[PDB]
């Protein structure tokens, strides 16, 4: 079958800049009718794919003129002019000339914005959970940029790595930041045997870890 390749973007793009994304096909997508059967989609974080361009260069209804498609029969470019925060997501090309109408692997667009420190919040186990025999300590590290961050847990001053589960959001469509949750899960017994719990964020925006603590 036709093999479709999409290239990584090496750099994040600032609001207002324009960026070109590449898609390549091992076979010409130009058909007998003179039309080139190549689509571009955006999939915004959490959403269904949305078509931007079909027949290589035609915009779908309602699609901003900021999006323009060009190409040969085998090398294609999507140019996104004057990038907006809401453009963040993964851009997929899809050949539409023959089965199996293969989608490319996608190219993620990241927005470059000003650095922002994480807003850190810590939460003791709920009384309801304690009743159940479990104890989860939750820490949110919210709306930071860039995405690179380290979280460290300390129990009574000593680092804890076991029982930590982390989750990270995709880049925000409105403010171009990232957020992260860190949950330290222990048995009720384990939790009752210690006093001081600390969530500590290391991020480029601060020389010192940004720490949040509570005493049981």
């Amino acid at each position: 079958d036709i093999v479709i390749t999409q290239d990584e973007l090496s750099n994040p793009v600032t609001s207002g800049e324009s960026v070109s994304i590449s898609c390549r096909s091992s076979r010409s997508l130009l058909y007998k009718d003179g039309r080139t059967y190549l689509n571009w989609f955006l999939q915004r974080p959490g959403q269904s794919p949305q078509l931007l361009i079909y027949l290589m260069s035609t915009r779908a209804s309602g699609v901003s003129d900021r999006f323009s498609g060009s190409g040969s029969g085998t090398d294609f470019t999507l140019e996104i002019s004057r990038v907006k925060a809401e453009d963040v997501g993964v851009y997929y090309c899809q050949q539409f000339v023959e089965y199996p109408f293969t989608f490319g692997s996608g190219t993620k667009l990241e927005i470059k914005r000003a650095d922002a420190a994480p807003t850190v919040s810590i939460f003791p186990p709920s009384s309801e959970q304690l009743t159940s025999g479990g104890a989860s300590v939750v820490c949110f590290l919210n709306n930071f940029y860039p995405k690179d961050i380290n979280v460290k847990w300390k129990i009574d001053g000593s680092e804890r790595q076991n029982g930590v589960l982390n989750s990270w959001t995709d880049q925000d469509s409105k403010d171009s930041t990232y957020s992260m949750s860190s949950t330290l899960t222990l048995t009720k017994d384990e939790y009752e045997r210690h006093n001081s719990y600390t969530c500590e964020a290391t991020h480029k925006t601060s020389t010192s870890p940004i720490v949040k603590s509570f005493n049981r």
Binding site: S61, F101, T102, P124, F140, S179
Partner: protein, 219 residues
């Protein structure tokens, strides 16, 4: 003005048959469009599965062998996907879409429906409030949360004050541990509006028919 919507079981056992429905409103399916099924795997790879067009013509991805059938019910303006002999490799989000013959779908895709293929059992989540330990700066912001723990399969939906609180929410991707998922959601509001106004998270798990509200109260 066209709208498409997928429906069907979110959990199917291995070797069993997956069945989904696409309900189309606003446009007749006895038309010259490729009424199509697409799926997106964990990790986000997209795969074209097949279409039905003009009521009686179909085409399928050869990768799906003879496991796939696409049919329609004209009376209900619905088209269907059947996928037999499923394995864990068929775990994906399933989408229906209306493709024209030139490749144009616009935004005529469904919201997608998650299908998990597993022998594991449906388990409802326990929902826990996340309040702050003490008092934090007033005339500023306060973050609250909910821990949605120990459910299977995906997905869960979290809202705050039944959708009234939409900005400043972060619902994190679930983490899988021992065939059970755990997710947290945070919400940030003016310290002026809490605890003076109520803040409650609404958690739904369709697979287990769970729908729980948990009010965040000062501890």
């Amino acid at each position: 003005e066209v709208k498409l919507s997928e429906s069907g079981p979110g959990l199917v056992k291995p070797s069993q048959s997956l069945s989904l429905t696409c309900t189309v409103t606003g446009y007749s399916i006895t038309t010259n469009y490729a009424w199509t099924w697409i799926r997106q795997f964990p990790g986000n790879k997209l795969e074209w599965m097949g279409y039905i067009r003009s009521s009686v013509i179909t085409r399928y991805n050869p990768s799906l062998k003879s496991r796939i059938s696409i049919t329609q019910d004209t009376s209900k303006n619905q088209f269907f996907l059947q996928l037999n002999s499923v394995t864990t490799e068929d775990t994906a989000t399933y989408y229906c879409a209306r493709y024209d013959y030139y490749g144009n779908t616009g935004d005529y895709w469904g919201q997608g429906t998650s299908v998990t293929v597993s022998s594991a059992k449906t388990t409802p989540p326990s929902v826990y409030p996340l309040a702050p330990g003490t008092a934090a700066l007033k005339s500023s912001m306060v973050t609250l949360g909910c821990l949605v723990k120990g459910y299977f399969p995906e997905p869960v939906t979290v809202t705050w004050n039944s959708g009234s609180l939409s900005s400043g929410v972060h619902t994190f991707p679930a983490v899988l541990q021992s065939d059970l998922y755990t997710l947290t959601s945070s919400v940030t509001v003016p310290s002026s509006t809490w605890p003076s106004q109520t803040v409650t998270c609404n958690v739904a798990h369709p697979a287990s028919s769970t729908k729980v509200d948990k009010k965040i109260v000062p501890r």
